[PDB]
Design a protein around this nucleic acid. Structure first.
Lengths: 93, 84, 108, 98, 93, 108, 98, 84
DNA sequence: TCATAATGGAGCACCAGATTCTACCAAAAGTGTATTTGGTAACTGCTCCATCAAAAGGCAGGTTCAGCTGAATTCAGCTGAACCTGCCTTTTGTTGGAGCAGTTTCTAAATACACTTTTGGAAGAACAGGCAGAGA
DNA sequence: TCTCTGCCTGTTCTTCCAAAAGTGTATTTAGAAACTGCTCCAACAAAAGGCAGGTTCAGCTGAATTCAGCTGAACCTGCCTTTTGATGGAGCAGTTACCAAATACACTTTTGGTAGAATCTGGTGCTCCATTATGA
């Protein structure tokens, strides 16, 4: 019992992009599927990158390269910018 | 209740026409309905075979939505809104 | 003893860095997971989620609707080139199709 | 009595069904078809209702996409009527047909 | 011993099926790529099967189901027959 | 100490059960790997290898060659419906294509 | 002098190149193309000879398959001549255009 | 070194014709050659982008055959015969 | 559907580059313990799926009926193919220089692995705000 | 493609429990430096075979017309679906008490990889066919 989901965080992101817009539960199910699907894509590609280069650790370099391999063009650019900003903020703490 | 047979014909001509209209088809050959039924049956056979393989591995007797989602994803037909 | 704060707050994220780190560790992707790997992955997931949600909310507003529905996610994804490419092999339940009639079919 | 010319109601139907999102096959006959197909792989199978709904959503999405490809192939042949050969060509180029 | 390949075993299998036939070096390279690719497919599907059912272990049940999911038609039947026979012989010993 | 007996010989296989077990353990496929999993996987890989090599040796015999080359592997794969299904998205380097001219293109 | 009618040498060549396996693009021009369009990683990339050969094998396999699909589309339109629209239809059904 | 010298034209008309002949093509429109050049340029751009991303991750300066094999597998175009 | 070219297949001889086939050796697979945990094996709740029954109401099925589209036939010009020169660009064989990809110590980040401690997030229930359901 | 109703459902407050946070240590892992040998790149040259261009011209493509087939559009009917409402039980998920079985650790031996040499198969010239393609 007590299964997990990203609903809380997807609603927190929605309240940022569109403070007055809500989301139906079916839409939130689609969004959970999207987040888990993309997580699996990134994590699988990063696992492959670590294996290819004979490494045991998946670091933020692996995630960056997986994002570059998987996302297209401007999505990859903005996602790399966001992840790098997040990691720089996290380490400065 | 008797065992099911010949249920492909329940995919009626008007239903196939609706699916064609959503696909943007203005005009349909009279032979498109049997072709469509065959294509649908092949697609369903392929997906349900994997869904039942997933069901059997889990030692279950009920086919769940996750088995279908896995069978589709296994075929490059990822589906959102039913789990995952 | 510091009173503890989430790694999402340190990274400035809404998405869960701790949960993502646990999922990475337990997902059998590698035997070790770096500290900034979950931060990077949660930031990327949040970015993509916000991108899709912004487009879907724009679609919802265009429809004079206050709530996003799978149709709005479909419209947002298929009307965006990058998202359409990323989610090109994905079917969204109850999203429909983009309205598109080929020009040669229209009245002559 | 009023008559619409051929293709006017077809265009109205195209707009109507591309506008909406509901399932275009009836649920009960599709469920019967799904159970009929499944009994060849295992007997006395049970189905969650959401499993049958996932199957119908996937099947209808697949058929709508295949019909988009079929209509492109019909147009390439300078026709507006889709024929079984258009479905066959779309399936062949998709890799579904040998 | 720096690299490793299936060439030795591919050649044993070849001498079984075709005693008087040889194999080119490029053909052997393709056969190595084939065995590695199929191993990756089956192992990845077995990993996913274990993850789905919340199991820590990849057993021969996971391998058998992965073969059923991946191989087509009669290939799956004969591969399952061979794998079951191999595991039976291994266990009897 | 009983003298070593390979697990392949116990299973009656040519493919390496111990190497396959080590590669399953090293691929981060799962936390644990059963004793019969490497045996099953080696048996399946050997079966598929023997199938392809049977067909490729038949192709080599047809072309009067006594040595298999990538062309013969391609011929075997593409002339077999099930292997062609299995390897439908695979490119074989230096294998060529199957001879096939559409009947419409032949002289009247 | 002797003249073969059109399509006779074309069919001879179809047989010739479906019988063989050698690469059909010249190696040096393809290597120049590969190095040129590596505008990714501006600049100073080096290539293994086998890297460029793997690229060429993949490229020629892709083009031969695409020409097979193009020819199917051309035949479907009741033509013998492949045209850019046949390539476009083949690539659209494949999912490559979008 | 770096080159930018219009060498997509090095993929000549006869080479494209040979590729079409191996594809079973009997008659070729004169507009097929520039179309094919564009298609090949797009395909090569995708594969080489992925291959160079793999090369950069490895902190290498040389693109290896394994980088190309990985890029092709990622694109859905698995290739045998180069070390996969 | 009779003879002349042009092509592709098919014998032979001669290599020469690749396979086989040996030897060493070191990396890795068996052997055998202890040992710890994951995974059956009963033994229940409890949900959920499967039959039934039965009213509307919508949808599908079968008939016209006519318009329009697919299919054919013809015709003409266009464009692609086949061929022959003359060029040029590739391919191959050499140096050589340099870069750079792997291999070895060593160290020091950084990761994993244990506790207790708090916090966050997942069940539930209560409530009002979308929005589907109808009014031309 | 138009306002106001009434239900569905999203939002939002309480538990509490699982999990994420902080220390505190231990230890593999990976980065850094160095060093070597392995390609990679880059010129020079030199045959020769692909290629580019120009010329005929034959066949294909596209346009126009006709016309028959067929298939949309509309209208009756019949049917079947769908939406409640029961209810029977089938099976799925959760909780224990094991225990088989997989991991982990030395130790030994073997096996598979890497050189190295020999043969020998496939390619490559020459040559002799046997098909095919092409008009009187």
């Amino acid at each position: 019992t007590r299964k997990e989901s990203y609903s809380i965080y997807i609603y927190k992101v929605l309240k940022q992009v569109h403070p007055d817009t809500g989301i139906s539960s079916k839409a939130m199910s689609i969004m959970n599927s999207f987040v888990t699907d993309i997580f699996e894509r990134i994590a699988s590609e990063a696992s492959r990158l670590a294996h290819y280069s004979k490494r045991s650790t998946i670091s933020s370099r692996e995630i960056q390269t997986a994002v570059r391999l998987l996302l297209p063009g401007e999505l990859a650019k903005h996602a790399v910018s966001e992840g790098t900003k997040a990691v720089t903020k996290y380490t400065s703490s | 209740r008797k065992v099911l047979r010949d249920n492909i014909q329940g995919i009626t001509k008007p239903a196939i026409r609706r699916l064609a209209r959503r696909g943007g088809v203005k005009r349909i050959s009279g032979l498109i309905y049997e072709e469509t039924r065959g294509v649908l049956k092949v697609f369903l056979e392929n997906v349900i075979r994997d869904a039942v393989t997933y069901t059997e591995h889990a030692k279950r007797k009920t086919v769940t939505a996750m088995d279908v989602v896995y069978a589709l994803k296994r075929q490059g037909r990822t589906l959102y809104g039913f789990g995952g | 003893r510091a009173k503890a704060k989430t790694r999402s707050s340190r990274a400035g994220l809404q998405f869960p860095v701790g949960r993502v780190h646990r999922l990475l560790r337990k997902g059998n992707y590698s035997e070790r997971v770096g500290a900034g790997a979950p931060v990077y992955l949660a930031a990327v997931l949040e970015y993509l989620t916000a991108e899709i949600l912004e487009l879907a909310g724009n679609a919802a507003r265009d429809n004079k609707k206050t709530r996003i529905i799978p149709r709005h996610l479909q419209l947002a994804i298929r009307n965006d080139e990058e998202l359409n490419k990323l989610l090109g092999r994905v079917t969204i339940a109850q999203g429909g199709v983009l309205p598109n009639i080929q020009a040669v079919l229209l009245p002559k | 009595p009023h008559r619409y010319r051929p293709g006017t109601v077809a265009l109205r139907e195209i707009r109507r069904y591309q506008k909406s999102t509901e399932l275009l096959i009836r649920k009960l006959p599709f469920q019967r078809l799904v159970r009929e197909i499944a009994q060849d792989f295992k007997t006395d199978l049970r189905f969650q209702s959401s499993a049958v709904m996932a199957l119908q959503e996937a099947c209808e999405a697949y058929l709508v996409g295949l019909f988009e490809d079929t209509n492109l192939c019909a147009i390439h042949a300078k026709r507006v009527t889709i024929m079984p050969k258009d479905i066959q060509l779309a399936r062949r180029i998709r890799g579904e047909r040998a």
